[PDB]
Design a protein around this ligand. Structure first.
Ligand SMILES: CCCCCCCCCCCCCCCCCC(=O)OC[C@H](COP(=O)([O-])OCC(O)COP(=O)([O-])OC[C@@H](COC(=O)CCCCCCCCCCCCCCCCC)OC(=O)CCCCCCCCCCCCCCCCC)OC(=O)CCCCCCCCCCCCCCCCC
Ligand SMILES: CCCCCCCCCCCCCCCCCC(=O)OC[C@H](COP(=O)([O-])OCC(O)COP(=O)([O-])OC[C@@H](COC(=O)CCCCCCCCCCCCCCCCC)OC(=O)CCCCCCCCCCCCCCCCC)OC(=O)CCCCCCCCCCCCCCCCC
Ligand SMILES: CCCCCCCCCCCCCCCCCC(=O)OC[C@H](COP(=O)([O-])OCC(O)COP(=O)([O-])OC[C@@H](COC(=O)CCCCCCCCCCCCCCCCC)OC(=O)CCCCCCCCCCCCCCCCC)OC(=O)CCCCCCCCCCCCCCCCC
Ligand SMILES: CCCCCCCCCCCCCCCCCC(=O)OC[C@H](COP(=O)([O-])OCC(O)COP(=O)([O-])OC[C@@H](COC(=O)CCCCCCCCCCCCCCCCC)OC(=O)CCCCCCCCCCCCCCCCC)OC(=O)CCCCCCCCCCCCCCCCC
Ligand SMILES: CCCCCCCCCCCCCCCCCC(=O)OC[C@H](COP(=O)([O-])OCC[N+](C)(C)C)OC(=O)CCCCCCCCCCCCCCCCC
Ligand code: HEM
Ligand code: HEM
Ligand SMILES: COc1cc2[nH]c(C)c(-c3ccc(Oc4ccc(OC(F)(F)F)cc4)cc3)c(=O)c2cc1Cl
Ligand SMILES: O=C1C(O)=C([C@H]2CC[C@H](c3ccc(Cl)cc3)CC2)C(=O)c2ccccc21
Lengths: 218, 360, 96, 182, 77, 32, 192, 282
């Protein structure tokens, strides 16, 4: 896994900049895979256009809350985190869309987000994330196609299919200290890879994003 | 920096009913600027040597053109610095200004501490009997910690080294003052001043025409009075005993600090334990600091009206003022049992009426 | 300063720097009002002060009587009694 | 702003559903528009003549409220000590106030004869007004009292001199003394 | 008719009226002063209120709150 | 005693009258 | 494992507090112990007749006269530098709001002149509680926000966006974030 | 979470995901549930329907017969206002507490307006159903409609159409409707116009609700819940309170006008649609 950037600067495609940032993940079969599935949910997502019934400025998710209160106007059009596992390695990170002049905050807020997982996360947040993750995953598996896809995917990835009770039992026992252990194992003071497109005059340096992964406080 | 000048001192909008009692801040600032001018021009001819400091101050008066004028303006303007500061403090105790001007009140306290330090350092530089023995006393008072006192002195006793560093420190501190003044005003204009009525009102009026002229009027009065006292000597503000050269083995037979230090002196006369003495100052200053967050010490919603007009109960600030004046009186007198007895009565009043401000 | 619901402007023209303090303290005129002023070159300005002197002075002096003078009188009393005690001590202790 | 609030539980100061410091009698309307009518049907104390201080109406609220060591001020209204989970129920028969917590965490607004959506509508804070409100609350017409002098008795009218020379002479005089001293 | 600064309310349909206090007999000592009400008729305070004491209070305050301190001081300091 | 007394304070009638006096459309220093 | 053990301590204590919860209103325990209640009850006849009575009557006389001189009400003494009252004032209806504005104007002018009002202008009760229904609502609204948002010491980015990062939401209200610009014309937060 | 009682931590630490951790105690012999619809009714009029498929997440929904085809010249826009006020303050809960609780349970919830129906719904694990039935029924049983919430919620009435300016297909849908039934019933617009922001006061909302939101105009539907628990917790919701009383409303037949309309904008295609009426409808 190489830590590098690949930026396509272009000022003739309108005001919006697109970015993705990535970290090194873990394989399908790794013990910590589940914790990774949880961390992706702890950071979560946001859209300015369509929002449900909770205002972003009062949301229980602290990352969304911090983004939506920036300069009182809020600094992002959309952001969403992701985790992908392969046979022998993974990727973990986020994708974002934001305005030319908001890009810097747009990115560093979410990096602060992800770095919090290793220092200061608390069980209110962990349980909120568990609830949302369970809702999502257990909510997909309704139709025959979803079930068949899940059967085959797990058959290839694990050599078996993991029954629901096992997943729930392994998810239950993860607490804050466990998240704060795994993050400290893989994400604190790590290498990152970056890609972007559009009005990238605002864009931060690679070294900025890389020194963001640790806090000098504490 | 002109745009800021206009925003804060020309177009800034005040309340219509700001009377003279709100003009004394400007006044203390002006005494600061003036004291700085006279300071610098006194430094050009002062000698910082224990062997000859005294005669250095006498040379200005005797052999230099207008030599006498700068020394006497510098000496007399100090009293006005302190008088204006005390009026300025009491105004805000009276109004409960600290209810919402929290950080301004803290900054104020820091500025008052700076001013005490500056004055006392100045008081040693003419190098007479009172200067030497005052320095001895105050340095012995902060003795509790080993080696700190010979270190700060520079020496086993008050010395020429002590004079040199006191002179440099007295040079420097006023300007730190100025910086803290800018900080003070930042916190102030962040909030906005209070009324004498303690209400919120929309009947505001701009500064430049109306309030600037009142500032100027009071400024005229103050310049007047300073020159009156400086040129003719109406009041014996400073005791004569600093006119005698120093002797390291004989004290002066009667002792009276500068008036703005007498109350403190009174305490040192009447409390038996020396540490109790020092702790009274520390405690009273801590109590004043504590007023900055008085809104938190109770769950009843607070108002600024203290309803002291026509009130037979008076108010704790007035009792504080009268207790302090009584302490000045007793400060001035000789040590005798009866003076000490009424001293202790007044001291208890002074401490209690400060503690009680928090109990609304 | 002012609450955010008072310092919200109707206009949209940029506030110039020299007017900062002016619009940080904006307040609404609930109900509106009418005001009249005369140029100070067309007013008497030392007769209005003396014309209303007695009323103003009555008010000011009335307000301060109890709160400032009565404790003052008590303090003056205390000083006189202290002087008495001292002038008696000085004879008891040292005169035969 | 830089200022906090102080909503917290307190053991020296009971909550306002328990011990209100204000006089706890309020009238209630079915719709706040009705408050218009009373303003044009009541009498008012300021429409009627009195001449001596001893004739001024006496306050409704009692002098005897707040107690304790070294408390100068003996009368207050409002406090921010926090409410419990289950508040004390207002007794509307005695015209006690029902507001905020005591509407949300109490059965006070319930009526057997009426839909709930209709019943709750009467408990917004605009539907309550104290007793004595229409009779005592002032509403000025001007900042100036007709018993005091305004500019009309000081204005320099037709026939008057020009005063620019005098004004500018005054200020020039001030300045030339100032300059000599400087 | 009513105690305090209240006047009998008009009967307006749609407004619910709180009960209002009837007037009570005043005590001696309130002749010619700005009136300040007495406690309710069924309180414990109205057993011990005495308006005639408001005249001596300017002396009572000082005596009570400063005399004992003076006595203590003269005894021990 | 009305002076300084919260139970009775009010202006004397002669002070209330001093405020009714008028010098409108008069000026005695015009020659200067 | 230190942290989980102290967790256990906290959790058991919280469960004790939870188990004792009532399900309905129960009157508060008295504010004073039985000793002091006894002593006060004993000394009442002297203390209330000679000292507390006249103190509490003089106080209301002083307050009423000062408010009547100026034509204020009592609830005109509260500021809007107080968050709860700021909310209460936001919730006011037009007429009450306008009358309050007018009374404050007149009071400012009268305190400038230092002239009494005529006694026939002073015939009203100043102690009507006209702000109460709104203060109670403000208290409710501002309590729920503490419960649902303020229950932890949240972590932020320092000295970014014009705010220190330790909790402020209005730019440049603290000294270390003063002077936001060195060139240009500045700006105001309300026009973003 | 004031501390935590369990100290054992991650009890499956270091076990790969292709290695099982189930004990034989957690095995079962499968019994299907029965999945034909179950139908019930409360005494006040409310109809209840339920199914179970043994999924872990449930779907809950309340259906009200209050669309926009029931408005008039004095009402236009009221249904949109009600939908834009869903999950606002009610008798026993505030807006903030309601939405924050729905967030922290993990659920997703919302409200939808049509031309003939209004729908509220929620979704999360089935074990949370007792906590969700109140919050859904609240909105129709006793909302407060405090003015300062109406005022703060206003801009969402305009954004709803401001976004339609970059959804040509939906735009053409609305054009078809307003041209087919000109100025009546199904013809009415699904949004608040500028003329619709006048009558945005609580009395009009409340008076409209009193005519439609009675129980016999409602249905409550649940999927993946046990029917006797659903019936129990629904009955326990209406037992203390008076619901909105019934009304014998009447509905007018739509009048189909037809006609023609054009709307130009820089789109690079000619979008066209032609339509005829279906007599009688559903
Ligand atoms: C003549 C006098 C001259 C005085 C000169 C003083 C110069 C000091 C400068 C201070 C440092 C810069 C501050 C800028 C912070 C920017 C704000 C911000 O967002 O920061 C976030 C950042 C927190 O990090 P984060 O947000 O978690 O994320 C970080 C990123 O992930 C990753 O980080 P990043 O990549 O974003 O970079 C962050 C960077 C930001 O900076 C930059 O980007 C630019 C570079 C900064 C300036 C570098 C030049 C400064 C030169 C240092 C040496 C000065 C010596 C002076 C001695 C005078 C001798 C006469 O901050 C730093 O790393 C600064 C580290 C150095 C400061 C710590 C020094 C304290 C050591 C105390 C040891 C005990 C000694 C006791 C004995 C007495 C000694 C006198 O804040 C900091 O940590 C900054 C420092 C905080 C101050 C700590 C307390 C200081 C007090 C020390 C004790 C005082 C002793 C006095 C007693 C005397 C006894 C007699
Ligand atoms: C007149 C006052 C002067 C004050 C001076 C202060 C000292 C300044 C020292 C530093 C120098 C600064 C210079 C500027 C001073 C200010 C100038 C100014 O603008 O004054 C405005 C001043 C008052 O203006 P305002 O707008 O009413 O002010 C608002 C009020 O303060 C009302 O404000 P509020 O209502 O908002 O209240 C807020 C509150 C805020 O609280 C405060 O501000 C309280 C501050 C208290 C002081 C706390 C600190 C004390 C620290 C200790 C100091 C110890 C010093 C020891 C000195 C010992 C000296 C022996 O203030 C108060 O409560 C103040 C009321 C206090 C009442 C006390 C009543 C005492 C009665 C005593 C009766 C004595 C009877 C004796 C009978 C004897 C019989 C034998 O008006 C004038 O001065 C008018 C001009 C008069 C010119 C007359 C010239 C006549 C010349 C005649 C020549 C004759 C020649 C004959 C030749 C003949 C040839 C044949
Ligand atoms: C080896 C030798 C050993 C010798 C040992 C000798 C030991 C002697 C110890 C003597 C102790 C005396 C105090 C006993 C207290 C008993 C308390 C009790 O039973 O409580 C039950 C019970 C407690 O229940 P509670 O629920 O707290 O109810 C009470 C309320 O909270 C109350 O609140 P409320 O709202 O009902 O009432 C209104 C409230 C609020 O009232 C106000 O705020 C009004 C304020 C008006 C002020 C107006 C001032 C105007 C004039 C100013 C003049 C200028 C002065 C400044 C300038 C001067 C120059 C410097 O009133 C107060 O706060 C009253 C404050 C009274 C302070 C009295 C201080 C006496 C000090 C004696 C010396 C102690 C040692 C000193 C230190 C020594 C060194 C460490 O309280 C009562 O029933 C009330 C009792 C009140 C009694 C007060 C009068 C006591 C008279 C004692 C005479 C002692 C003579 C000693 C002679 C010694 C000769 C050798
Ligand atoms: C120029 C500055 C340089 C630029 C960079 C900035 C430098 C600052 C870095 C130091 C801060 C580290 C601590 C991080 C805390 C993070 C907590 C968090 O999540 O944030 C949210 C949290 C606020 O959120 P919230 O809870 O919603 O707000 C509600 C209130 O907090 C009300 O909450 P409550 O009422 O519920 O009570 C809560 C309270 C409950 O606890 C208490 O109240 C305990 C009271 C017990 C009394 C004992 C004193 C406690 C204070 C300890 C002070 C020791 C530190 C100094 C050690 C000296 C070593 C030489 O909680 C605490 O006190 C916990 C925090 C206490 C930490 C304070 C000390 C941290 C300093 C550590 C490094 C020391 C090295 C310094 C080297 C020498 C130079 C200074 O943040 C804080 O509370 C801030 C705490 C830290 C103080 C602010 C930092 C100072 C910034 C201004 C600079 C002033 C410099 C002046 C020099 C100028 C030179 C020309
Ligand atoms: C830039 C540094 C300047 C230093 C000044 C020292 C100069 C030498 C000594 C004084 C010489 C005489 C004064 C100059 C002549 C007058 C100026 C002029 O043309 O008038 C313009 C005008 C004159 O206005 P006018 O209305 O009188 O007349 C002009 C109109 N016509 C021409 C039609 C007549 O002056 C002003 O309006 C000034 C407004 C302020 C007035 C009050 C000031 C009093 C002081 C306030 C507090 C001071 C503390 C602050 C200082 C900080 C340090 C402590
Ligand atoms: C707020 C500002 C100041 C205050 C309150 C202050 C106070 C004093 C005091 C009380 C004295 C005693 C004079 C005497 O006893 O005769 C003094 C003397 C002196 N001050 Fe300051 N001072 C201030 C600023 C300055 C400054 C800025 C300087 C120089 C830069 C300075 C230099 C001196 C000198 C040289 C003396 C010696 C006077 C002599 O020997 O006769 N002062 N000061
Ligand atoms: C060198 C010392 C000081 C200077 C130069 C200074 C200057 C000023 C100025 C110019 C003002 C505004 C105008 C005025 O109030 O006159 C002010 C206000 C104020 N000052 Fe000071 N001050 C000093 C000391 C103090 C002290 C010692 C305190 C408190 C112990 C203090 C507390 C306050 C407060 C509370 C206000 C505002 C009061 C209100 O708005 O109601 N200041 N100061
Ligand atoms: C009667 O009522 C009032 C009188 C008032 N008088 C004055 C003089 C001011 C004032 C002071 C300083 C300032 O800006 C400055 C800060 C610091 C400096 O530095 C130093 F050291 F002073 F020179 C200079 C300049 C801006 C404004 C007030 O606000 C003010 C407010 C009220 Cl209500
Ligand atoms: O005995 C003393 C004495 O007690 C002080 C004292 C006065 C108060 C001073 C002081 C006390 C507290 C503070 Cl915060 C500041 C100054 C310290 C010196 C003198 O100033 C003095 C001068 C000359 C000879 C003897 C003496």
């Amino acid at each position: 896994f190489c830590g590098s950037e690949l930026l396509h600067r272009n000022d003739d495609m309108g005001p919006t900049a697109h970015v993705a940032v990535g970290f090194e993940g873990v394989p399908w079969k790794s013990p910590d895979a589940v914790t990774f599935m949880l961390m992706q949910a702890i950071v979560g997502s946001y859209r300015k256009h369509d929002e449900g019934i909770v205002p972003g400025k009062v949301s229980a998710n602290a990352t969304v809350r911090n983004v939506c209160n920036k300069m009182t106007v809020g600094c992002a059009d959309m952001f969403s985190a992701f985790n992908t596992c392969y046979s022998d390695t993974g990727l973990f990170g986020f994708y974002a869309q934001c305005d030319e002049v908001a890009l810097e905050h747009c990115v560093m807020e979410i990096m602060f987000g992800i770095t919090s997982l290793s220092y200061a996360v608390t069980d209110e947040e962990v349980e909120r994330a568990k609830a949302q993750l369970k809702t999502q995953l257990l909510g997909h598996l309704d139709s025959t196609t979803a079930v068949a896809e899940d059967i085959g995917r797990q058959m290839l990835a694990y050599g078996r299919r993991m029954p629901l009770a096992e997943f729930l039992k392994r998810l239950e026992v993860i607490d804050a200290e466990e998240v704060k252990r795994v993050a400290w194992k893989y994400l604190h003071d790590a290498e990152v890879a970056v890609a972007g497109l559009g009005p990238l005059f605002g864009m931060p340096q690679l070294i900025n994003l890389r020194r963001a992964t640790f806090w000098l406080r504490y | 920096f002109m745009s800021l000048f206009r925003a804060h001192l020309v177009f800034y909008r005040c309340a219509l009913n700001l009377n003279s009692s709100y003009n004394f801040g400007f006044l203390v600032a002006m005494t600061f600027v003036l004291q700085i001018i006279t300071g610098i021009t006194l430094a050009f001819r002062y000698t910082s040597e224990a062997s000859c400091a005294f005669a250095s101050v006498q040379h200005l008066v005797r052999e230099v053109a207008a030599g006498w004028e700068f020394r006497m303006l510098h000496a007399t303007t100090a009293s006005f610095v302190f008088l204006c500061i005390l009026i300025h403090m009491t105004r805000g105790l009276y109004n409960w200004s600290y209810s919402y001007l929290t950080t301004a009140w803290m900054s104020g306290l820091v500025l008052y501490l700076l001013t005490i330090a500056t004055a006392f350092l100045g008081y040693v530089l003419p190098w007479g009997q009172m200067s030497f023995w005052g320095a001895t006393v105050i340095t012995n008072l902060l003795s509790p910690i080993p080696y700190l006192v010979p270190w700060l002195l520079g020496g086993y006793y008050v010395s020429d080294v002590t004079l040199k560093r006191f002179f440099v420190l007295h040079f420097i501190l006023p300007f730190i003052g100025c910086i803290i003044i800018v900080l003070h005003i930042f916190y102030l204009h962040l909030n906005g001043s209070s009324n004498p009525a303690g209400i919120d009102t929309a009947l505001k009026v701009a500064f430049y025409p109306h309030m600037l002229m009142t500032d100027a009027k009071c400024l005229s009065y103050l310049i007047g009075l300073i020159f009156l006292q400086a040129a003719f000597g109406l009041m014996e503000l400073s005791h004569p005993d600093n006119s005698i050269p120093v002797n390291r083995f004989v004290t002066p037979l009667h002792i009276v600090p500068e008036w703005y230090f007498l109350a403190y002196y009174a305490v040192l006369k009447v409390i038996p334990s020396k540490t109790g003495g020092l702790l009274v100052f520390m405690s009273s200053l801590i109590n004043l600091g504590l007023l900055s967050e008085i809104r938190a010490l109770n769950t009843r919603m607070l108002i600024r009206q203290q309803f002291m007009t026509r009130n037979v109960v008076s108010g704790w600030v007035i009792i504080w003022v009268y207790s302090m004046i009584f302490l000045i009186i007793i400060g001035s007198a000789i040590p005798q049992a009866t003076y000490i007895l009424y001293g202790r009565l007044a001291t208890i009043l002074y401490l209690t009426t400060g503690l009680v401000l928090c109990l609304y | 300063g002012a609450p955010k619901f008072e310092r919200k402007m109707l206009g949209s023209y940029p506030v110039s720097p020299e007017f900062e303090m002016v619009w940080r303290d904006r307040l609404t005129a609930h109900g509106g009002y009418i005001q009249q002023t005369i140029s100070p070159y067309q007013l008497k300005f030392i007769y209005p002060f003396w014309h209303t002197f007695f009323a103003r002075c009555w008010c000011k002096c009335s307000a301060y009587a109890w709160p400032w003078v009565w404790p003052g009188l008590i303090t003056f009393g205390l000083v006189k009694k202290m002087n008495h005690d001292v002038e008696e001590d000085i004879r008891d202790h040292y005169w035969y | 702003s830089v200022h906090s609030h102080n909503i917290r539980p307190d053991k020296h100061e009971l909550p306002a559903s328990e011990v209100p410091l204000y006089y706890n009698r309020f009238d209630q309307a079915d719709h706040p528009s009705l408050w218009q009518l009373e303003e044009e049907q009541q009498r008012k104390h300021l429409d009627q003549e009195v001449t001596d201080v001893s004739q001024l109406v006496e306050p409704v609220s009692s002098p005897h409220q707040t107690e304790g060591w070294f408390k100068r001020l003996r009368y207050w209204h409002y406090k921010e000590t926090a409410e419990p989970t289950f508040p004390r129920t207002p007794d509307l028969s005695k015209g006690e106030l029902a507001a905020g917590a005591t509407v949300t965490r109490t059965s006070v607004w319930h009526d057997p004869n009426e839909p709930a959506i209709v019943s709750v509508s009467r408990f917004a804070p605009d539907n309550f007004r104290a007793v004595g409100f229409a009779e005592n609350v002032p509403n000025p017409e001007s900042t100036n009292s007709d018993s005091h002098p305004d500019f009309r008795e000081y204005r320099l009218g037709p026939g008057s001199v020009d005063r620019r020379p005098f004004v500018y002479f005054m200020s020039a005089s001030y300045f030339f003394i100032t300059a000599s001293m400087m | 008719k009513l105690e305090g600064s209240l006047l009998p309310p008009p009967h307006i349909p749609g407004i619910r009226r709180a009960p209002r206090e009837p007037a009570s007999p005043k005590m001696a000592g309130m002749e010619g002063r700005m009136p300040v009400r007495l406690p309710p008729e069924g309180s414990r305070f109205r057993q011990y209120v005495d308006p005639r004491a408001d005249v001596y209070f300017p002396l009572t305050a000082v005596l009570v709150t400063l005399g004992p301190l003076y006595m203590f001081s003269k005894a021990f300091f | 005693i009305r002076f300084g007394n919260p139970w009775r304070d009010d202006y004397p009638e002669w002070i209330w009258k001093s405020l009714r006096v008028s010098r409108k459309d008069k000026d005695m220093f015009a020659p200067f | 494992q230190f942290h989980r053990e102290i967790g256990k301590l906290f959790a058991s204590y919280s469960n004790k507090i939870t188990a004792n919860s009532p399900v309905q209103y129960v009157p508060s325990p008295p504010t004073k112990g039985k000793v002091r209640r006894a002593l006060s009850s004993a000394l009442m006849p002297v203390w209330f007749k000679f000292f507390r009575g006249p103190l509490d009557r003089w106080n209301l006389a002083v307050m009423a006269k000062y408010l009547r001189d100026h034509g204020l009400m009592y609830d005109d003494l509260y500021s809007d530098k107080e968050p709860v009252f700021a909310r209460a004032l936001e919730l006011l209806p037009p007429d009450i709001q306008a009358a309050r504005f007018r009374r404050l104007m007149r009071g400012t002018y009268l305190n400038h002149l230092r002239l009494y009002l005529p006694v026939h202008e002073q015939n009203y009760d100043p102690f009507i509680p006209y702000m109460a229904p709104y203060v109670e609502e403000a208290k409710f609204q501002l309590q729920e926000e503490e419960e649902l948002l303020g229950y932890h010491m949240w972590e932020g980015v320092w000295y970014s966006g014009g705010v220190t990062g330790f909790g402020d939401k209005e730019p440049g209200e603290h000294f270390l974030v003063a002077l936001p610009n060195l060139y240009g014309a500045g700006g105001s937060p309300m026009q973003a | 979470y004031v501390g935590k009682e369990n100290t054992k931590g991650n009890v499956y630490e270091g076990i790969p995901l292709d290695q099982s951790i189930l004990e034989p105690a957690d095995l079962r012999d499968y019994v299907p549930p029965h999945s034909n619809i179950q139908y019930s009714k409360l005494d006040n009029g409310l109809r209840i329907a339920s199914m179970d498929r043994g999924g872990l997440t449930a779907s809950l929904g309340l259906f009200v017969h209050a669309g926009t085809r029931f408005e008039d010249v004095t009402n236009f826009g009221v249904t949109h206002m009600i939908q834009n006020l869903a999950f606002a303050s009610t008798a026993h809960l505030s807006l903030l507490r309601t939405v924050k609780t729905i967030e922290v349970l993990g659920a997703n919830a919302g409200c939808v307006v049509g031309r003939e129906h209004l729908v509220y719904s929620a979704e999360c694990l089935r074990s949370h159903m007792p906590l969700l039935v109140p919050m859904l029924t609240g909105n129709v049983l006793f909302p407060r409609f405090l003015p300062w919430e109406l005022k703060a919620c206003k801009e969402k009435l305009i954004m709803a159409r401001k976004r339609l300016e970059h959804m040509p297909d939906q735009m053409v849908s609305e054009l078809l409707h307003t041209t087919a039934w000109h100025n009546n019933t199904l013809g009415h617009k699904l949004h608040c116009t500028e003329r619709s922001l006048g009558h945005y006061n609580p009395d009009v909302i409340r008076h409209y609700m009193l005519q439609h939101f009675s129980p016999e105009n409602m249905v409550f539907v649940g999927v993946n819940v046990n029917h006797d628990e659903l019936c129990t917790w629904l009955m326990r919701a209406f037992v203390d309170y008076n619901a909105i009383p019934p009304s014998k409303r009447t509905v007018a037949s739509p009048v189909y006008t037809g006609g023609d309309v054009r709307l130009e904008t820089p789109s690079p295609h000619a979008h066209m649609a032609i339509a005829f009426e279906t007599p009688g409808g559903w």
